[PDB]
Each structure stands twice: as structure tokens, then as C-alpha cells.
Amino acid sequence: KLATDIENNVRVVVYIRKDVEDNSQTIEKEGQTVTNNDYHKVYDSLKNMSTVKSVTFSSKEEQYEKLTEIMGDNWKIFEGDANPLYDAYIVEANAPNDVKTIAEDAKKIEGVSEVQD
Ligand SMILES: CCCCCCCCCCCC[N+](C)(C)C
């Protein structure tokens, strides 16, 4: 059994604003590698909810690889361009009934772009 395998009825997906790097520990400033003060701001608010069991980062890169894996071949015409997908956290609720509450509080976290239940 693996951690990234969560049942449909208890999964909430939390999409991160495209200009927030919640999973990046360091960023570039003045040519140096320095602390990202916004690191895990969204992660921690989700992890602090009493009804959530796990929160796992899913990058936009990873989401596109899996899409090409599940559907046919890569989507060649977009290969030169930026990835338009959103980084996301995959949140596991403690019970199905907690999902609607989790998704509502999640949209109120600053940095959260959208939440899918
Ligand atoms: C409105 C929704 C339409 C969006 C469809 C876009 C498909 C994403 C392809 C990204 C490939 C870029 N690449 C190679 C760097 C990962």
C-alpha cells in the first residue's frame, strides 16, 4: 500500500495560484539561492485541519506526465510552451462527510486558486 493512493469519496484536490510556489524551499533573489518565506504556507493550513489525514504535493509537471501515460502519446503541438496546469495538493479526508467542509475552508486559504471535491 502506498501513500499517494486515496479513494475517490475522500479525496479533495487543492489547486495553487500560478504565482505561488508552496512546495519550493528556496527561490532566486539577487542571483543567490535564498529561503522562500512562502514555503508550505498552504500545506500547513491544510495539514492543520483536524479532519484531514494527509496532504501530498502533485506538481503540474507530474500531472501532465500521468495524463500522457493514461491517454495516448504526448500532446506534441504544445511541447515548446509553458505547462498551463496548476500545482496541487491531494488532500485525504478522515471521512466522506468531512469533504465538503474541507473544500470550503480550503478555498479561503490565501494562495489557493481553486478546489475540486
Ligand atoms: C483550457 C485548457 C486547455 C489546456 C490544454 C493544454 C495541454 C497541456 C500541455 C502542456 C505541455 C507542456 N510541457 C511539455 C512543458 C509539459
Residue numbers in the entry: 49 to 165
Give the original sentences from the paper that presented this experimental model.
FtsEX comprises a cell division-regulating integral membrane protein (FtsX) and a cytoplasmic ATPase (FtsE) that resembles an ATP-binding cassette (ABC) transporter. Hydrolysis causes a conformational change that is transmitted through the membrane via FtsX, an integral membrane protein with two extracellular loops (ECLs), denoted the large (ECL1) and small (ECL2) loops.
Three different structures, with resolutions ranging from 2.0 to 2.3 Å, were solved by X-ray crystallography, each in the presence of a different detergent. The detergents used were dodecyltrimethylammonium chloride (detergent 1 [D1]), n-undecyl-β-d-maltoside (detergent 2 [D2]), and n-decyl-β-d-maltoside (detergent 3 [D3]). In all cases, two independent protein molecules are present in the asymmetric unit, arranged in such a way as to keep hydrophobic residues from their α-helical lobes buried. In any case, the crystal structures suggest that changes in the protein backbone and side chains of the helical lobe occur when a detergent ligand is bound. These changes create a cavity in which the detergent molecules insert, with a large part of the helical lobe (from Q111 to E127) affected by the interaction with detergent. Full stabilization of the hydrophobic tail of the detergents is completed by the same hydrophobic residues (W123 and F126) but from a symmetry-related molecule.
